[PDB]
Design a protein around this nucleic acid. Sequence first.
RNA 1: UCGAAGGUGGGAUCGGCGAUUGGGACGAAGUCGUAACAAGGUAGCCGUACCGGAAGGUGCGGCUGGAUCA
RNA 2: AUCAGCUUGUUGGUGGGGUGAUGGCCUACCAAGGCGACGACGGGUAGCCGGCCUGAGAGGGUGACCGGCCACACUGGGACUGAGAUACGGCCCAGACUCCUACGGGAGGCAGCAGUGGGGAAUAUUGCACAAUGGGCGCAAGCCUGAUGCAGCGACGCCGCGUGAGGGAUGACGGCCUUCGGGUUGUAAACCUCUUUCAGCACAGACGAAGCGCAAGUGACGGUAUGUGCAGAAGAAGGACCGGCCAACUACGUGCCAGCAGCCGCGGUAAUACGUAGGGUCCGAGCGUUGUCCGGAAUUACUGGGCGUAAAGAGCUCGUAGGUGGUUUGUCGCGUUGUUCGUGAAAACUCACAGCUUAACUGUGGGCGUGCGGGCGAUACGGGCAGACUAGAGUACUGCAGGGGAGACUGGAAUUCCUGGUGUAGCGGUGGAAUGCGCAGAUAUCAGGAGGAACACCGGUGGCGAAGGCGGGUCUCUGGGCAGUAACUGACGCUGAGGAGCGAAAGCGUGGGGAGCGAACAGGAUUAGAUACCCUGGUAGUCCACGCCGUAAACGGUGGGUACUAGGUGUGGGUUUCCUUGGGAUCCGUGCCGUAGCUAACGCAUUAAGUACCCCGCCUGGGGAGUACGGCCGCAAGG
Lengths: 48, 198, 32, 130, 122
Amino acid sequence: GKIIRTTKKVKAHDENGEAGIGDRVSLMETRPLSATKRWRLVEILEKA
Amino acid sequence: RGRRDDRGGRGRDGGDKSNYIERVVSINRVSKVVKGGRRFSFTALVIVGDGKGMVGVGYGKAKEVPAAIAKGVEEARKNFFRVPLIGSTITHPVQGEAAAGVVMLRPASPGTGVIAGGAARAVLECAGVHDILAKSLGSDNAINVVHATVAALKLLQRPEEVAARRGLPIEDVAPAGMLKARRESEALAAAAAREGSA
Amino acid sequence: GSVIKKRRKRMSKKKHRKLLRRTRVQRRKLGK
Amino acid sequence: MTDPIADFLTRLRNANSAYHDEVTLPHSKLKANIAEILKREGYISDYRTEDARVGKSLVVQLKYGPSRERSIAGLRRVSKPGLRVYAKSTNLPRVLGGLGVAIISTSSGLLTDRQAARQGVGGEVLAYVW
Amino acid sequence: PTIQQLVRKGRRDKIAKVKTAALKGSPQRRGVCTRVYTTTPKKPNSALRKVARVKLTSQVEVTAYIPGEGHNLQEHSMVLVRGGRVKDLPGVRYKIIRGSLDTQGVKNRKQARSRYGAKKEK
RNA sequence: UCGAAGGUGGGAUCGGCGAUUGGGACGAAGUCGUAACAAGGUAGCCGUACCGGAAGGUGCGGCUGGAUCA
RNA sequence: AUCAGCUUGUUGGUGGGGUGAUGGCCUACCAAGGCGACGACGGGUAGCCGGCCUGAGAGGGUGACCGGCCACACUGGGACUGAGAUACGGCCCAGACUCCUACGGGAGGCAGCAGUGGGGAAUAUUGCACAAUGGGCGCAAGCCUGAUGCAGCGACGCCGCGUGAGGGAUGACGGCCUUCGGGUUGUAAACCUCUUUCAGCACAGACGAAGCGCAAGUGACGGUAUGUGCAGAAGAAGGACCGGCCAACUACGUGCCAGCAGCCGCGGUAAUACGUAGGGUCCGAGCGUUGUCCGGAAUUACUGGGCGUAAAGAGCUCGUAGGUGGUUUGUCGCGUUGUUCGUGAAAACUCACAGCUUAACUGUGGGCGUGCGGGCGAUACGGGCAGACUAGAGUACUGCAGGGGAGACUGGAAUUCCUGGUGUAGCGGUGGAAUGCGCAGAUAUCAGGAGGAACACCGGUGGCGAAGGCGGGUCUCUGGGCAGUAACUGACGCUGAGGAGCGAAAGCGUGGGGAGCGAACAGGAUUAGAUACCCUGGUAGUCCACGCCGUAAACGGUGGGUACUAGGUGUGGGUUUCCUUGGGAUCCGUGCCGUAGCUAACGCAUUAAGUACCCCGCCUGGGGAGUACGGCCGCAAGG
């Protein structure tokens, strides 16, 4: 019953390089764009 | 405990009032080393009670077995103990502990039967219960499970007592199914009681 | 508690120490 | 200081076990709601909130019987940090066959088990007292 | 204990504790018997116990006990060894079936009758 | 171009057997002593070092799970 | 993790290529990442699931039948054909094997249904039909179908029925006990009526087919099921157990034998425990044994355990990830919760009902499907974000106590040796002695000198340090604690897997030093014998400098933090109100006694082993064994 905090190192696709390290980005599932790049991000919220 | 069936032309067997229910749980000869050998004595853990739900616990020490049983009868006679019920059940799930004796005494729907091990089965078969559901956790003994069961029955209380402690009008203390069981058990008390008057 | 447990344990320990005295040499060379 | 409410109910078990007349506490919102529930079920007599060193304080007088005997026959924190126990509506866990009560902090505030049953909402437990 | 310590690692059962190493999880194994010598038990129980060590088909070397009054089996008999327990001789935990492939049932056995393999009187 | 099997090569790793040898468990009963339990006849035990046919003995520091009370 | 790093089409980009389709799927170039203590890469085992078994449930075990997916078809590669391919009864190649050959070369592939050999404790007939249902081709008739439908075989399982019923004695024959009266078998039997299911022999004989068919017929099962008849108690009971748990006891026979036993344990000439008999008990076409699993086992404890002494608190700290978080306003709706939609195939499971003479069995209708996804709602609590606060935490200021640590310089008493006096035959040692030092001038005493180590008294249940540990003095450098004010910061806290550091004594390396004590080592004595105690001598060591090592009864046998819970009396540090040093109150420390509560007991008891919360360590019967194997650290001993 312990509410475990778990992490998930997904991989994601920026065409325009809008995100940087530390950001609060969104995600959305896509077609398999390469070998485990299955997410693209729209409407990045906060930059660093 | 042998050779009890007997017919005597003497004064009296002194059979009289208080035909209670009496159960002898265990007897283990207790030895004591003294200079030049062993002195054997006897311990009888005596349960007495009536089918209302009053229980005794007696502990007899004597160097004869019916003497120890009779002393346990007189000691539980000296020390009775009131157990509160609902119908012929128990009120609510308890756990009793006598220093290693754990016993869980949980109620059940009627018809189920007294399900307990032999010491707790003795203390509950003498008492006024017919359908509860217990278990003896730990200590694997007779004396500690009898005494733990009686401590467990000391952790019992009436629904009404709880209402009184909190200054609340019942209804407001119980839930409703158990109040309906109060109506059922007092109703059969009325039926067998008014059949008892005629 | 009792000292008997302690002494059984220590008997084992002693015996082992001796066994490493006598095999000291042998373990070095058979190992090397 | 790791759990606030465990120190609250802990102080009520100690002050209840040692025959005390009142008890003093650091006032907070959740302790005020629990004190209001134990008011409304009659396990404690009444509480008053003082101003003190820096903050407000909670002074609870405990309700005793016809002699020195106690109304709160126990406390037990169940929704403790580390195993916070959650409860759907099917079962607001019944306590002591129903004779005890279960302080359950649903989305409507803080309720008891019975109020969580009739009003049709669950979502926590907290400590349950008998 | 401190439930996150059980989320990390903890609370596994101990060990399967397998009773018999005959093999395969098989109830009885036929076997070639060798050297049927008779032994001496522990100190409160003094007698001569009629054991025979048997090479089970399962390639292992065990030592089984022969229950009953006497043994028809000599060297190189095909005895059908089941698993049992004899406390009394240390290391012998298998019992040879009496009334089997080679070793005949116990003769004039009239009361025990399923063990010891005695067929019914005509 | 790729490519299964085959060949050569030097390794990983899991085992089986091995003369001889170390210890271990059980046996009754044998030999040798008597280390421990009573201040067990030098209080015992821990660590470590050294020595001794064996239990063990001694040193250095520690400990009461030590005793009687100068 | 006794497997910690692996990866170079490997990670991403662009241009091509390929595909039914996205894509390092592929390729050329460019960039250099990516994955890992939420266990990467390796090793071991394993088809997965609806389910089944067990269980109060939570869970544990399992994946047989039936059903759903997956993988393979002698071993290993490959494509082709096609809407679609692991292509079981296709192709091509290479292997291993079986077989035919006129020696040139061919042929095979039961993990389809039967069946044979082998392996094994063990698992069935080389059956009959496409009548029914499914499938294929065909306009249809129809043809094919070892799918299926049925039959055979095995008490292999589950359920039902039978082996008779009613009468029948102060209780026969026989048996075995006996207190020699009798008692049991036993209303049981013989006998006397009665009834015959099921097997037996007769004659009749299905439903499954609102089917197919343009033919007139058609049921494999089948002359089966099932009816109605006939004869007559007529053909039909066994297995385990009777010391204790655990329903059920007596005699005879062997008397530590032969044997028994699930554990405890029974056998040494009076066994209710061995073997046989009577008798009883429990089951019954079965009843015992062995194996495998769940249960009881709260005995891996989420529900539901523990750690002073029973197994169990790392020697002690600091700190990375992690876990956990005081007061209060707002916002988000990730946790939580409410509701509705979708879904969780069928079967099973549970409830009701219907069908088969009943039941097992089968069917119909609910529930179950404890879950997951979508929409809408709630905002107490947890969390996120944005803020605010001063009680926790830390800092400043004023003091105060202290064998806290390191370096340097120095002090005296005592022991030993040295030189010189004075001076003689013993000194030393012991339970009692003897080796020993002496008579060459010892021990004794006086004066002087060397040198080393340890610090009498103060000094103890006392101080300080995280723990080891720390006491001659002084000086120099430095660490922590406590109180008071509240000036500042504003939750910066707690714990801490791995990790680094400190860590008595003994021991180790290199170089010094070496008075006393002193393992080993001698002699003496004691003793049966001392490789021991006791005595005389005595080397490494003990000391210092620089490093190793990492262990202890490193013990309060008690991990760290926090809040609370009657007191009484000592002593250590400091603030203040009152008498005026005495008491009071307060914060921090350390002891002795004591309630409540707790504990198996002893004990603990505001310095908890009490009441609760947070994090870590650790335990799962005793030996084997803190040992082997492997790795890591170490100069080695070893850890």
